């Protein structure tokens, strides 16, 4: 079982690595071609796709009355895109925001701080309603704040929306590949821990917008990610979150909101008043580093 345990990580790496590029390449040409900016097309349609695990894990959680693995991942993804993924991009690649930009960061930061107070008793059906609404809102907002579209309306686009697709097909399956592959490993040597197998697919919904950032990041397109962040978080939350609800009421986790919280507010005054460039990064990574070793 080992054999085709290293088949499958060591593949869904490839398709990870390669498949973050394409998906990345792809929707940099699908922006220009809507004539919107590099993070609106990361905030919306990167966004949604990276997100895709969370919104079945969360989903399939809940509905198998484990609603704290739900809440937790939605919420553990979060913290991960602002602390890990942007943390660094910031490094590798610093961003200047616009103050176009600035605006729909304080809109997230709002977002969360929202979700932060009604989830304070936890998160009812009726909350997750409330905040699939708001997501559906920003969406379309940032779509048309976002939008200097002109056209009119046939190769060009083909080529650029099967990029995209397909890198996008890759990164999934390159990351429940990677899961797959190394939760094989980890029977066949006896190493199976039951919250152990929580922390690599709970990582795992997090490689999607990790590779791909990373790929955006190496090409300079910082506002790429930027927008990747903040849509999955959005995402996580209006989305994962949300439908987590749904089927059943998700225990409160104050403790990772006020830190999600606080990191939104860092992320809105490193935006708004100076850069997301190193010092940030790595503030953002130190962040992570302290998050991942006292949290539970
Ligand atoms: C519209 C965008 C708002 C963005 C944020 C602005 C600041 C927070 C404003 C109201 C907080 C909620 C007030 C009502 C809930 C208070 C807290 C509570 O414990 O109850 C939650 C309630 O049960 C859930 O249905
Ligand atoms: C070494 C890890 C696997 C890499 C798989 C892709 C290798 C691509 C090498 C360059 C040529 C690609 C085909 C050109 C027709
Ligand atoms: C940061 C990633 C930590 C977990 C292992 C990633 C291996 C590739
Ligand atoms: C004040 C809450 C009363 C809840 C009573 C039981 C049923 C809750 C059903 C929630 C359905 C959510 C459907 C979302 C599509
Ligand atoms: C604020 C950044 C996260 C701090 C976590 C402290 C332990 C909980
Ligand atoms: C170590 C973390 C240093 C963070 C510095 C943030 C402010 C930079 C100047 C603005
Ligand atoms: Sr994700
Ligand atoms: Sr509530």
């Known amino acids: ?65 484990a609603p704290g693995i739900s809440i937790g991942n939605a919420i553990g993804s979060c913290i991960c895109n602002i602390g890990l993924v942007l943390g660094l991009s910031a490094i590798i690649s610093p961003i200047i925001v616009d103050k176009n930009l600035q605006k729909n960061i304080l809109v997230y930061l709002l977002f969360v701080i929202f979700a932060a107070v009604i989830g304070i008793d936890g998160f009812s059906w009726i909350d997750g309603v409330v905040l699939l609404i708001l997501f559906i809102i920003y969406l379309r907002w940032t779509v048309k704040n976002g939008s200097a579209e002109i056209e009119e309306n046939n190769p060009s686009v083909v080529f650029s929306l099967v990029l995209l697709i397909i890198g996008l097909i890759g990164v999934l399956v390159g990351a429940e590949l990677f899961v797959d592959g190394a939760k094989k490993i980890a029977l066949a040597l006896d190493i199976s821990d039951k919250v152990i197998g929580f922390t690599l697919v709970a990582f795992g919904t997090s490689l999607p917008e990790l590779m791909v950032s990373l790929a955006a990041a190496k090409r300079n397109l910082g506002g790429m990610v930027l927008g990747n962040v903040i849509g999955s978080n959005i995402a996580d939350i209006g989305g994962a979150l949300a439908v987590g609800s749904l089927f059943m009421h998700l225990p409160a986790e104050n403790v990772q909101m006020a830190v999600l919280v606080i990191m939104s507010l860092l992320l809105y005054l490193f935006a708004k008043y100076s850069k997301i460039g190193r010092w940030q990064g790595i503030l953002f990574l130190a962040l992570y580093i302290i998050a991942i070793a006292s949290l539970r």
């Open 1 to 65: 079982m080992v054999i085709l345990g290293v088949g499958y990580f060591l593949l869904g790496l490839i398709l990870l690595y390669y498949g973050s590029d394409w998906f990345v390449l792809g929707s940099e040409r699908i922006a220009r071609h809507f004539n919107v900016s590099n993070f609106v097309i990361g905030a919306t349609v990167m966004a949604i796709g990276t997100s895709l695990p969370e919104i079945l894990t969360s989903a399939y959680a809940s509905y198998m009355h």
